[PDB]
Symmetry: C3
Subunit: 317 residues, 3 copies
Amino acid sequence: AKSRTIGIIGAPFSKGQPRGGVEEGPTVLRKAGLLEKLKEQECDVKDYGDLPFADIPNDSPFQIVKNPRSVGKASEQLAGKVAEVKKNGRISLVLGGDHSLAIGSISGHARVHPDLGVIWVDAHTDINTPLTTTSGNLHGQPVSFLLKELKGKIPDVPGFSWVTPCISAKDIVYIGLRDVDPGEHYILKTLGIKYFSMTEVDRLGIGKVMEETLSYLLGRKKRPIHLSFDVDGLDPSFTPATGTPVVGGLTYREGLYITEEIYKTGLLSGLDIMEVNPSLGKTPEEVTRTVNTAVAITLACFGLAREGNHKPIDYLN
Amino acid sequence: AKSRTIGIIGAPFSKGQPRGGVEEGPTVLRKAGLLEKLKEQECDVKDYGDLPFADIPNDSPFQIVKNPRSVGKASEQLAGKVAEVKKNGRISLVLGGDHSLAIGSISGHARVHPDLGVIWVDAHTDINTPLTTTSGNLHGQPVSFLLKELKGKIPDVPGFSWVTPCISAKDIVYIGLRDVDPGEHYILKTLGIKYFSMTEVDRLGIGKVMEETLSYLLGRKKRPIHLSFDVDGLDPSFTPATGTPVVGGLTYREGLYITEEIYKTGLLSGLDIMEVNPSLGKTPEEVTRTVNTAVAITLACFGLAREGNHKPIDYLN
Amino acid sequence: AKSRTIGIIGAPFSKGQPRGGVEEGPTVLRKAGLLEKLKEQECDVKDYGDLPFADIPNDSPFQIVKNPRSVGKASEQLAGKVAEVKKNGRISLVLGGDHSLAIGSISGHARVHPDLGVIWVDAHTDINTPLTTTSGNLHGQPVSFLLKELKGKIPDVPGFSWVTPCISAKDIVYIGLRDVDPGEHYILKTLGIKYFSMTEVDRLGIGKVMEETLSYLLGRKKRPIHLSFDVDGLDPSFTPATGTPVVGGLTYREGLYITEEIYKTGLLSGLDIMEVNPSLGKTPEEVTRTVNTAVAITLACFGLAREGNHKPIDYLN
Ligand SMILES: N[C@H]1CN[C@H](C(=O)O)[C@@H]1CCC[B-](O)(O)O
Ligand SMILES: N[C@H]1CN[C@H](C(=O)O)[C@@H]1CCC[B-](O)(O)O
Ligand SMILES: N[C@H]1CN[C@H](C(=O)O)[C@@H]1CCC[B-](O)(O)O
Ligand SMILES: [Mn+2]
Ligand SMILES: [Mn+2]
Ligand SMILES: [Mn+2]
Ligand SMILES: [Mn+2]
Ligand SMILES: [Mn+2]
Ligand SMILES: [Mn+2]
């Protein structure tokens, strides 16, 4: 089935942020048996392997922006790989790797499906520009590079000349926001982007959040869905092995609900599983908890339901 | 009052599953002060003791089905004990023991009140038949033995010739589901059983879940309610000393809400507190946490309200 | 701005309850950087200091009521300090200290704003009278001293002759109740006080809870809001270093939701942050978790939003 035909892309890349270990995310998600688990769920899985990201020595900052050429090149390569998977009629499944890789993942997905609408699950908006950033970490900026409305607000950053903004402010929905920088809040409000911060989740419940998200993106006409999932979108009691944990996040149940609802549209076309950092657990159990939650999230995207699943056969015979 | 008149039955039985210790459930719930706590809540409590379950040596399997004669006999004896408590005008309170004991609890209760509706609080449906089961553990099959629509799908299992299905698929509501076998999902869907898996709980909220459950069972006419509570229905952060724990369960609040709402009907007629296994805690605190949550759930069933309680006297005099 | 103009009052007082350490609540909230954090959020903060509470030797009980003169005097002094802050056109921010101090905090606030409405966030009603109390702890009685409908039910307690009931039963809404004494439940029902015990929160969701609370208090016309927040209203998994912890409380998210909603009215006029006890943590982390949650609560009251905040400047220039 279309909704269960997958192309796995490993993106072992960490230079969009300063914490070592996020490059081990594809390895640990594979070691947990993600591919096997998906195959046991009637998925047609093709593994495109782990992208080689050749070292760029002397990758000096663009102002405060760290490793621009490396981040630019990794996303550029990933865009080509995602476009190939999309041309092969498969849902692209990007195993990260820091969230700067979403530049390549969506850009690549938008080359084959330009009418796509994004669902961004994160505690963070990742919408800082190279000029509003105070950290210079590119995993906090991918959305600014992708938005058509911010063309003219993005300076010429080395490694990013290949980037053409592929999404309008109306084609993205945020879910799980709770750590937004002033520049980002300003951008979010002046561009009128649709979002459900934890405040809206608390007000409405995840049921109405999903009803509104899917209606806002798909109401007019069915279109492909790109879900960019930052594991820090979920509460640190579920995904603690991550770079930027923020308290009061989405529960394990809320995460499964989001992904179950997306599955049920039959329109998932791209998926990013990001910011899993296996060297950031306080104990080895914190690492396995994060990886297991990330696996459970991914499996929900491709049909795994809490009410159960069965094959189209008579089990009472 | 009818809703606070109780007959306690201990069912120290473990052979419906492979993990030792669940037979200690009645002991540990009693030691926690359950009887005394109920009496402090204006309950008329009579203790019918712990059933003796005389050893059946040479209880060889029926195909893959383990200890069929022992499970069959324990349920058969429990049905007789429950029918006696029901004849004595008391709400039967079965302290388990594994969930295969629900065969006897509900069969026994249905002898006195054949019009009863069942609320099944669990992470599992427990509706495998002796032919769909892959484990052969009878705690995973009690509902299949009880359903009238499955008559002809249940083979002649040694120890179960006394069983006559007493409930129709429309007389049961499941709450908390999150671990359903394929055969069970097939049965659940083809029989059109009403259920609220974690997915529906997430979508609707526990408020609407309870409104729908009580309307669905009591809308046509008021009838007696049998609540079969498996402690694994709740999240393992609340009930960890249990055999088959599954992440993402019902919260402590959701468990208290379900039982509050049932109490308020004035129609609770039978209660099962099952799967408490005091030898399955990782620490002694995990055991006391489980037992305390089970006690709290029980007290809500017999009137303990979070808003408070008061006697019909003038407290300001 | 009115909603961000604050007068800080430290109330290091513990004699309304028997557990030592709650007098250290103002110290630990200050050490966490509360004042500085408020100033970084565009608040105009004036610090009125920590009240000196002189020892009252020979403070004999009034029946079972412990330290009546000390509790009466601390509240009396606090009422004078709150009235001063209110006359200076600032929102009074009381850092406690036990909940007995709410006698002084609301009485003082009502002298300047007699039309105020009270939101009481707590696991408890604190509405026991000196005659319904079984513990004799005055932090479990402040509402009874304040209610006009209970005039004639409050005996002449030494230290409280200065007290004039300033609020009617219709001017108070409780949120998070789950541990109510019989006498308190009787008072709550016979006076017809509006409340959302954890049962109503579970039923309605915090969104509807807040909608109803604000409509019930502000419906007729805008009036000043007094939020008396007891950190035990929140679940002990968020605020464990407190005297009277009760399981199944409001979540970190729900607490922030209540305070974000109150901020948005622009009508917060009085705030109490009570029952933080830094000597009641099991680990040093339990203390920092409680203090951090209490800081987050206070900050949402003065504008800190989870969707983010920005200054009225062009961030894209
Ligand atoms: N503290 C946040 C908000 N802004 C910061 C930045 O701009 O560097 C961090 C970005 C998180 C990226 B993430 O969502 O992929 O984790
Ligand atoms: N993992 C579940 C689903 N089905 C399995 C089986 O058929 O043996 C397990 C039974 C649990 C019993 B219980 O609900 O009483 O806890
Ligand atoms: N268990 C409660 C209810 N009544 C008791 C009392 O009257 O002393 C306890 C007081 C807690 C007050 B507090 O909310 O300020 O913590
Ligand atoms: Mn991100
Ligand atoms: Mn993030
Ligand atoms: Mn069960
Ligand atoms: Mn179960
Ligand atoms: Mn209080
Ligand atoms: Mn309290």
